[PDB]
Amino acid sequence: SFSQHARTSGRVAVEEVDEEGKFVRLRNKSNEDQSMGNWQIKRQNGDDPLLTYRFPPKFTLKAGQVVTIWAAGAGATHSPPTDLVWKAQNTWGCGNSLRTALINSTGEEVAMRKLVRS
Amino acid sequence: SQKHRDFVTEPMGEKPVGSLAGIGEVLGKKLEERGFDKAYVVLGQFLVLKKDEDLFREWLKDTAGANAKQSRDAFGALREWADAFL
Amino acid sequence: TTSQKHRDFVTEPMGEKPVGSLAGIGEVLGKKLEERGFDKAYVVLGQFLVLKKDEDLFREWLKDTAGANAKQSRDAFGALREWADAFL
Ligand SMILES: [Cl-]
Ligand SMILES: [Cl-]
């Protein structure tokens, strides 16, 4: 259904993007902890307005750990550091092109996963 | 092709020119002789030509003797890769 | 001393950005690059990549094609080397 295109320039990867828009999953693929306070996930679905999730001001993703950022409508609970809920947003969005990018607190794109419909 | 999927799904980095779809052994060595040894060098040529299909495929046919299928597959892999990572 | 143009360029994919978005590419240098088919930043990335990321060849190409000075060529090269190391 969708072809996957991913890039990781630092410690944390955009490991999985739910095709149905329930969540985005990140993994610290390094042997060091990553501070991600005020980091963002930019989500561009086709030409629809950009959605941007903002991590809490203090958040550490430990070495080797996963964090799933759930949309509020997926029926998930806010249980850190493994699961965060995007309070404002009930879906990550649908479309033919779904681009999820991890950004540091200063606007640097450090990782992405893009799903393009076949 | 299996090569096309392996190429368009991730950054190309220092991959050899042979990792690009359409680039067989003969076409790859003739590209390597002309200074197109890594896949990023052919991406570079594709980008200098403003991603134009006719100019890129004609360049691949004239520079290293690619056939129509090889040129189409290399152009398609580079176009898809650039649309995701550039 | 990295310019605000350098910082905005190396931190994200260049996409369809104009050649002027690249560090070192001022208004005169940009117009001269546009006039010779180097209209978008990705076209200059392309030239940088055809030259195998070589500093001396890229910088002398930029001077011979669009009249860049040493500073402009150094800043353009530095922005493309950093961008390629993160996104390529
Ligand atoms: Cl054809
Ligand atoms: Cl500058």
Author numbering:
A (entry chain F): 429 to 546
B (entry chain C): 4 to 89
C (entry chain A): 2 to 89
Published text:
BAF is a small (89 amino acid) protein that localizes to the nucleus, at the NE and in the cytoplasm. BAF dimerization allows for its binding to LEM domain proteins and the Ig-fold domain of lamin A/C, while each individual subunit can bind dsDNA. More recently, BAF was found to play a direct role in repairing ruptures of the NE by recruiting LEM domain proteins and membranes to the sites of rupture. Nestor–Guillermo progeria syndrome (NGPS) is caused by a homozygous alanine-to-threonine mutation at position 12 (A12T) in barrier-to-autointegration factor (BAF).
In order to further characterize the effect of the A12T mutation on BAF 3D structure and binding properties, we initiated a structural analysis of BAF A12T by X-ray crystallography. The only interaction known to directly involve alanine 12 is the interaction of BAF with the Ig-fold domain of lamin A/C. Therefore, we determined the 3D structure of BAF A12T bound to the lamin A/C Ig-fold domain at 1.6 Å resolution. Only slight changes in the relative positioning of the BAF monomers, as well as in the structure of some lamin A/C loops (especially at Ser433-Thr434) were observed. We thus concluded that the A12T mutation does not affect BAF 3D structure. Despite an apparent similarity between the 3D structures of the WT and mutated complexes, prediction of the binding energies from these 3D structures using the PDBePISA server suggested that the A12T mutation changes the thermodynamical equilibrium of the system, with the mutant binding with a free energy ΔG that is 1.8 kcal/mol less favourable compared to the WT. Also, both BAF WT and A12T dimers bind to a single Ig-fold domain in the crystal structures. We obtained KD values of 2.7 ± 1.2 μM and 33 ± 4 μM for the interactions involving BAF WT and BAF A12T, respectively, showing that the A12T mutation decreases the affinity of BAF for lamin A/C Ig-fold by about tenfold. In addition, we noticed enrichment of PLA foci in nuclear blebs of a subset of control cells, indicating that blebs could be a site of increased interaction between BAF and lamin A/C. Together these data show that the BAF A12T mutation reduces the affinity of BAF for lamin A/C both in vitro and in NGPS cells. Here, we demonstrated that, in the presence of BAF A12T, lack of A-type lamins accumulation at sites of ruptures does not affect the dynamics of NE repair but leaves areas of the NE devoid of lamin A/C that are more prone to re-rupture.
